[PDB]
């Protein structure tokens, strides 16, 4: 059977790349911090990096300290560091928009190659290399489009200063793909809430991911009430569970982990650590309720 938690992931020694994403007020950034905190704690021997391309600068806001292009150890953790970067800025600095955009996946590839440069620059200079990276992906756009590039890139090469850089990109991207398509090296974690639109958007995300040969076995469902353990909340929960029952039927072989709603916003290492444990061991509204209330 398939456990409704991330434990196998959280304790995984093979994975070098964990992608976390979802669209909406779904609580993406908090999930990314939880996942990164859990792995870090569970694997003190390995050094982790959490990076966010989200423009809103959510990491600094979540941990309560300032992060940037320069990797910093999050205060209170000796194995976890954070980076917040703007890939569009990184492009604008260096930089035919018609010629680029005309083909799908080129614009994203150039944006991504900038974040890879930043990472290896943080590893070289300091001398501290990261064992596993957690990407908090932008809530909008399609970030992984560059994964189907080589296929559509080598197909447009056969028929057809410029030629070189293109084939070079094809090469780099294929080298990456060899990583991102290995389920033991790389996986994607979807974040949704139980409501129709989020669940639809989440399905399409999964499909797109499968089309890139990206491994996705994991879905985090946030903001669940578990009200039966306020007449308004009670009703809302009745709906959340309506879809919950069907999510479980839709992805059977997925780890679909159910996360409790917390009033107000979760911030700071302490609250995050206390909350992030429900990714490793499934939250139980009966026993764990006290933990949730004390965060308020």
């Amino acid at each position: 059977t398939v456990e409704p938690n991330l434990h196998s992931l959280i304790t995984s020694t093979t994975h070098k790349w964990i992608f976390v994403g979802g669209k909406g007020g779904v609580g993406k950034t908090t999930s990314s911090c939880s996942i990164a905190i859990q792995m870090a704690l569970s694997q003190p021997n390995k050094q982790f990096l959490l990076i966010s391309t989200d423009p809103a600068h959510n990491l600094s806001d979540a941990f309560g300290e300032k992060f940037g292009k320069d990797a910093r150890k999050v205060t209170g953790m000796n194995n976890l560091s954070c980076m917040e970067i703007d890939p569009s800025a990184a492009l604008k600095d260096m930089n035919l928009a018609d010629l680029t955009g005309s083909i799908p996946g080129i614009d994203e590839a150039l944006s991504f190659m900038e974040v890879m440069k930043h990472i290896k620059r943080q590893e070289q200079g300091e001398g501290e290399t990261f064992d596993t990276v957690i990407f908090d992906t932008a809530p909008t756009g399609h970030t992984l489009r560059f994964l189907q590039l080589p296929n559509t890139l080598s197909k447009l090469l056969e028929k057809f200063d410029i030629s070189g850089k293109l084939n070079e990109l094809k090469a780099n991207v294929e080298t990456i793909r060899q990583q991102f398509t290995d389920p033991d090296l790389t996986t994607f974690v979807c974040v949704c809430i139980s409501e129709f639109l989020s669940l639809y958007e989440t399905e399409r995300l999964i499909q797109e991911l499968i089309s890139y040969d990206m491994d996705v076995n994991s879905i985090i469902v946030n903001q669940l009430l578990f009200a039966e353990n306020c007449k308004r909340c009670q009703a809302r929960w009745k709906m959340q569970k309506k879809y919950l029952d069907q999510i479980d039927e839709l992805y059977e072989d997925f780890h679909v982990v159910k996360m409790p709603l917390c009033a107000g916003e979760i911030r700071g290492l302490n609250n995050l650590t206390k909350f992030s444990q429900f990714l490793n061991k499934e939250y139980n509204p009966i026993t764990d309720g006290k933990v949730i209330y004390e965060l308020e």
Partner: protein, 62 residues
């Protein structure tokens, strides 16, 4: 042979759609979504047979 198997999948795809639109994606979301997956699968097949069909034609001039 080939050209018949295409026309039959276009029919199937059609019948599925007509059905999926008879059910509530809200209430039935599990089933509904499964059906959506199948529809995409068929659209991929139909557009595979169109290719095969027009191909063995263009090549038939020999």
């Amino acid at each position: 042979e080939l050209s018949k198997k295409y026309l039959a999948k276009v029919k199937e795809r059609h019948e599925l759609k007509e059905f999926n639109n008879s059910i509530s994606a809200q209430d039935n979301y599990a089933k509904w979504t499964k059906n959506n997956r199948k529809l995409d699968s068929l659209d991929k097949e139909i557009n595979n047979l169109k290719d095969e069909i027009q191909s063995e034609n263009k090549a038939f001039q020999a």
